[PDB]
Amino acid sequence: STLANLTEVLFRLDFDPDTAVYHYRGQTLSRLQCRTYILSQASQLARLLKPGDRVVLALNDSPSLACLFLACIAVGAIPAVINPKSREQALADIAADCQASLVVREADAPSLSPLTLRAAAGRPLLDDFSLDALVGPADLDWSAFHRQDPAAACFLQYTGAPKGVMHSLRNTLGFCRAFATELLALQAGDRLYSIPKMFFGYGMGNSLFFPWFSGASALLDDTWPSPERVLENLVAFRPRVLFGVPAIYASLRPQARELLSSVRLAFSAGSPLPRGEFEFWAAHGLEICDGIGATEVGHVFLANRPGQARADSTGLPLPGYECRLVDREGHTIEEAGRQGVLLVRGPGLSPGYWRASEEQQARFAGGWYRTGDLFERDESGAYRHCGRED
Numbered sequence: 059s060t061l062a063n064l065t066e067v068l069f070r071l072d073f074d075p076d077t078a079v080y081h082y083r084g085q086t087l088s089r090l091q092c093r094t095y096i097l098s099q100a101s102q103l104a105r106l107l108k109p110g111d112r113v114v115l116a117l118n119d120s121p122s123l124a125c126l127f128l129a130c131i132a133v134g135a136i137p138a139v140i141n142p143k144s145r146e147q148a149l150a151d152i153a154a155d156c157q158a159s160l161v162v163r164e165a166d167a168p169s170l171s172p173l174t175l176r177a178a179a180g181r182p183l184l185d186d187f188s189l190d191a192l193v194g195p196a197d198l199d200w201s202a203f204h205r206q207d208p209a210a211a212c213f214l215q216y217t218g219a220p221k222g223v224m225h226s227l228r229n230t231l232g233f234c235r236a237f238a239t240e241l242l243a244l245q246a247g248d249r250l251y252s253i254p255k256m257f258f259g260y261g262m263g264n265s266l267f268f269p270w271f272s273g274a275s276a277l278l279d280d281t282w283p284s285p286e287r288v289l290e291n292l293v294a295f296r297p298r299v300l301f302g303v304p305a306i307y308a309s310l311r312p313q314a315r316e317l318l319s320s321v322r323l324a325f326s327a328g329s330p331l332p333r334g335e336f337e338f339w340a341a342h343g344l345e346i347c348d349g350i351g352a353t354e355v356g357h358v359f360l361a362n363r364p365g366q367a368r369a370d371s372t373g374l375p376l377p378g379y380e381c382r383l384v385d386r387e388g389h390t391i392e393e394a395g396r397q398g399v400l401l402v403r404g405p406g407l408s409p410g411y412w413r414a415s416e417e418q419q420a421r422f423a424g425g426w427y428r429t430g431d432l433f434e435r436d437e438s439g440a441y442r443h444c445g446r447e448d
């Protein structure tokens with residue numbers, strides 16, 4: 059194929075560079091402001107990292123995290139975003155698993171025993187992460203994108219021993235198109251608010267990629283989402299699309315009036331949406347679309363479609379995806395009402411784990427991802443979660 063760079067591709071999308079992309083602490087950054095900052099930061103990272111070097115970002119959601127992530131990709135580095143409050147041994151184990159060359163952490167955090175840089179105290183709108191003092195200020199017109207095969211590993215997503223899922227340019231644009239375009243039909247200018255953070259694959263797509271992919275903007279909050287905080291954000295930001303999980307919508311019941319004010323598309327992932335929650339908000343005039351995603355598949359690959367959602371259901375495979383149920387002998391289940399393990403194949407499929415044993419990599423056997431989830435399929439074709447396999 060043609061060598062390409064995921065960041066460069068996103069920067070090339072023909073969206074108004076003067077429109078917002080990220081929101082943070084009441085402020086706003088446009089596509090142009092972030093593009094310029096990313097290129098500048100890339101000139102600094104290229105002095106520190108070579109193509110292929112791994113980077114672990116133990117940071118909460120912020121524009122500097124999204125920009126640093128994309129700056130790593132710009133130079134050919136392979137970044138991963140993990141829980142900033144990860145325990146020392148957990149962060150060390152992840153950095154060891156991907157043999158990271160660089161770890162970026164919050165302020166005052168201890169050192170790992172790879173190179174450790176810390177973010178600045180005060181939560182600035184754009185942080186240099188001490189790169190100015192380390193490698194000097196940035197170059198003014200940087201554009202030395204490292205272009206590689208679209209199927210090559212571009213970044214990692216970590217989910218017992220941690221497993222790092224490889225994601226490439228191809229299957230990244232794949233799961234963005236399938237979900238952000240074909241399922242949600244996100245429009246330029248849409249205000250997005252994802253409560254799950256960017257160290258969760260769910261949140262990375264919601265907050266990091268979709269604003270660039272679809273021309274929308276996302277609210278980034280580096281504090282933990284207490285229902286009180288979630289409320290302040292809703293009131294101040296008034297998002298049109300809300301990415302939550304079942305428990306989040308349960309916690310939002312007493313604030314239904316405030317949520318209905320702006321939210322028009324409410325999505326739920328992570329675990330099955332109970333009928334009670336779907337029906338509580340349906341009577342308030344809000345449809346919650348339940349969809350399943352998996353780190354190994356990029357994002358949601360099977361979901362209820364807006365305007366056609368049903369209670370106690372995960373919907374249908376997204377366009378381009380194929381879903382199959384297998385019995386205890388690995389044989390395809392052709393019938394309805396028979397629960398089996400769900401296999402999935404499609405645009406978002408990851409090319410595999412970064413480091414793993416043959417038994418772990420076997421989850422990708424045959425060109426499918428074995429979710430380990432028990433699913434059944436009714437006559438209409440809709441899937442319903444039934445639990446996990448033993």
Ligand SMILES: Nc1ccccc1C(=O)OP(=O)(O)OC[C@H]1O[C@@H](n2cnc3c(N)ncnc32)[C@H](O)[C@@H]1O
Binds near residue numbers: 260261326352353443
């Ligand atoms: N990474 C993601 C991106 C987008 C959206 C979700 C994710 C995400 O959750 O990624 P993970 O790798 O952490 O977990 C995947 C596993 O979580 C479970 N699950 C997720 N969503 C649902 C759902 N709607 N209904 C029922 N079960 C669900 C299921 O066991 C699955 O195997």
